[PDB]
Subunit: 291 residues, 4 copies
């Protein structure tokens, strides 16, 4: 469908993943209107992250924020691949960070990243599969969304993003109905305790799982987790999504798992990534008390 | 007016800011009587900060302490620019620290400074505006006063201190009456939570704001804070105050905001500053219990 | 006796210490079936420690896990010396870690080791007695088992493992019946407080003692502990057990103490050790509440 | 008077300070009987500190421990200068540490020293007065005794130990009767709060004061503390005690203050000191509950 300032079309891999592309005029107007705040200003004054968010939504006639929220909160969808025409070179890295910052802070706020000391983190890669998982399993607070942007890609074969929607996972019911699905388990980076499965407000399964940080306490927990891991990694429902330079995935971390495919080692290989993670925060008509 | 040991006259920028100058005999007597305690002694034994305070007040016939307190606690004023005749060269830095220490510890106590590990901190600058703000917004305890002294100034164009009294701010009522003025917000350097506005004992607005450390939790808080920031930075009520070498501002941090103007970059530029921050502490006739 | 996949025979030093040796086919099948997970995978994903445990037990027709548990929990025994035919060279260090990991995680889970940052630790030695003690005396949680493997041994004379079963200690009753046996004492690596003696579920003495970390608070506690130390170190019941390359002791840390004999200094000496420590965790028919 | 294994005589400076000297046979027997434990063994196994204490007391026919306790707990005395004939050279430093350790752990236990990471600390000096004070004012637990030993002394003029017994302080009543004597004040190295004065079990004044770590909160506390400091430092009751190599003071830290006199700077100057601090711990006939 055609919106004001951007277009929206389903991905080739799945109708659950929608591709959102900002038009060229929108992209140029946005970058002009945020030129006076470099990324270092966004790092130092967090309210500027919401200022650039409002500027982008205003340029889309205030159609962007409700669309982002409706897509990410919809159980049938919950995932976007987002880009802006004209921003597609490593040479535009700062502008990429601004764009992703503006989109993310229309639907919530990105959390402190311990690897960078900032609200976002950039990594340079210079080859085995990274297993499907959820982010933020080792703290008490829930991470609602994961944002992963491709900043550079050079002599790279493979390395697609892997995604798994729980309602595409053919083994969901077998593991969700197991008593250990509800057993609170230790997660360690202070340790936290929570089950591997939970439910959304409608009672549908959600997941908070990663094989590296879950700490089975005994032979019962450990064997079940090793079978769970195999059942996830071999699922027929996994998507393999290329993320070209300038595009970023933005997914609901509660019923999407994500990972990374193998890639070929190459002497002239360079991949650069940017990530942000946060919680949803939005207005809705709902009950309160007092005045 | 003419006091014992010093003179007092309103500043050129505002009747709220009073200039206090210690006479030459007072300055020389004070420095003689505190010569046996170097600044390093003041750093190691905090009671010596109150000893030098008493010596200065005694030399002013005990007229200094009540005058400082009356000025700083008066809502109509609350700010002083202070100097002593004959102390005006970088070469006298230690004597400047002694003088500011004595004045500050007549009205309270200066807190530990994490940048220096001492009760005061000195910084050397070797050019964009520093936005108006209050100090101490990221801890639970209230910072009542801010002290900023000019220790050296060399090939410096611009860089005046900026000040804003809340009762000179033409947008005060518009933002103080907004519901978000009372919303406790996160501040981070353990995080603390407090609103951007509060009230003094008479119900008049006070502020605890800085754009770098406030952490809006969502799009509502963030957009409002970005508008608040603009309304402060563009206020017609801002003062631009030069602070020559040997002078220091001492302001009530609850209804004065402070910042720093732009200055010209220059290869031979050198500016040195000293700061202290603390809480008020003073005698008054008021109620207590027991015996 | 002859089991499926391994043999079991009493040690030459004591009927309480049983020697368990995995046959050559079992050893080769196990190493083949765990080849796809290097030790670094076991370090990163703790459930793989239980996966390799199940593979080893399955190869022993599920006779290994009940035998290990019965031996370690039996007050009359409680100690094993374990090896696998064909694994006996420093050159096979990784395979040794896999084997010990699989055995340990059939009976419990190995705890984080602060010296290595992993669930196991390897040390290289390149000569006085190490006194008998229990592990884990300076934390609140109980360490149920100690695992010590010989990874390398080169020009080494002496250095046998020393072991003492409390029911072989001729002075047990004299010290267990002393009032200070029940006095909670300070242990320091946050400090913890617990007595030097306790009881098992049947009221038989157990010990949580080490001379380096216990901190007697006064002359009464200190003199008694110095006599206790002498009564332990001179006991006639101490075993001197050689541990050849590829063998590991696995002992119940509650009623076995362990140490190390003196060895000869030698310029070409090299000894490498691996340790793990953990708690028991196993299924049994016992009571619970609710559903 | 003549005891078994040592002699006791009042000092030249004060009848409150008793000089205790171990005879030559006692010193030689003690060092022989503790030869198998080097100081590093005392550092690692704290019960050995009580073992060497018992050996020394046994060599004195068990007359040492009751004498030490009676002297240190007696309000009229409370201070000892202790040495052993034949130990008086830097070359005997280890033996000095053993001797002081044995004496201290007959009357209590020495606490962890943050400057050395051990139960004792050695310092090398290579010249202004160190003001009179009590140790341990910045933690909650009470330090009952201070031990300071002279390990080396080379080209040293001055630098006597200074001591002040509260009942020799001519200004005690003037300050003890001031309301601020009972005001809990902040002490900082987590901060602790306690008054500068307290009382012993008989209601007689004791002190917990040091000028460097007390943190007066305002002009009232600070001026009083500066006058208190002057009243202490100028007291006629201060003792000036030389401490030759091999001697150590052992004083009751509750009603003795201690410091150090000025000394002459000299290019070939070397002074080495050892300190321990701890709490009293001893048997007495007193009430308890239960069985
Ligand atoms: Fe991730
Ligand atoms: Fe400031
Ligand atoms: Fe051990
Ligand atoms: Fe001291």
């Amino acid at each position: 469908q055609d919106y004001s300032g951007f277009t929206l079309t389903p991905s080739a891999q799945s109708p659950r993943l929608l591709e959102l592309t900002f038009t060229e005029q929108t992209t140029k107007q946005f970058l002009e209107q945020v030129a006076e705040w470099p990324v270092q200003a966004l790092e130092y004054k967090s309210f500027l992250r919401f200022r650039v968010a409002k500027i982008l939504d205003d340029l889309c006639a205030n159609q962007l924020q409700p669309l982002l929220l409706k897509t990410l909160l919809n159980r049938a969808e919950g995932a976007l691949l987002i880009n802006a025409v004209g921003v597609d070179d490593v040479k535009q890295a700062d502008e990429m960070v601004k764009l992703a910052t503006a989109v993310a802070h229309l639907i919530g706020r990105s959390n402190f990243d311990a690897m960078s000391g900032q609200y976002y983190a950039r990594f340079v890669v210079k080859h085995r599969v990274m297993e499907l998982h959820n982010d933020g399993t080792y703290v008490e607070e829930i991470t609602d969304y994961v944002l992963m942007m491709k900043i550079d890609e050079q002599n790279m074969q493979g390395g697609n993003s892997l995604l798994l929607h729980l309602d595409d996972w053919e083994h969901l019911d077998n593991y969700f109905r197991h008593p250990l699905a509800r057993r609170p388990m230790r997660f360690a980076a202070k340790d936290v305790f929570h089950p591997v499965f939970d439910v959304d407000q409608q009672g549908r399964p959600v997941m908070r799982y990663i094989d590296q940080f879950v700490q089975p306490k005994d032979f019962e927990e450990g064997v079940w987790l090793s079978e769970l891991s195999d059942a996830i990694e071999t699922s027929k429902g996994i998507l393999s999504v290329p993320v070209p330079v300038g595009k970023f995935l933005l997914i609901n971390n509660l019923f999407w798992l994500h990972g990374r495919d193998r890639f070929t080692p190459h002497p002239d290989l360079r991949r650069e990534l940017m990530r942000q993670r946060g919680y949803f925060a939005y207005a809705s008509n709902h009950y309160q008390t007092h005045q």
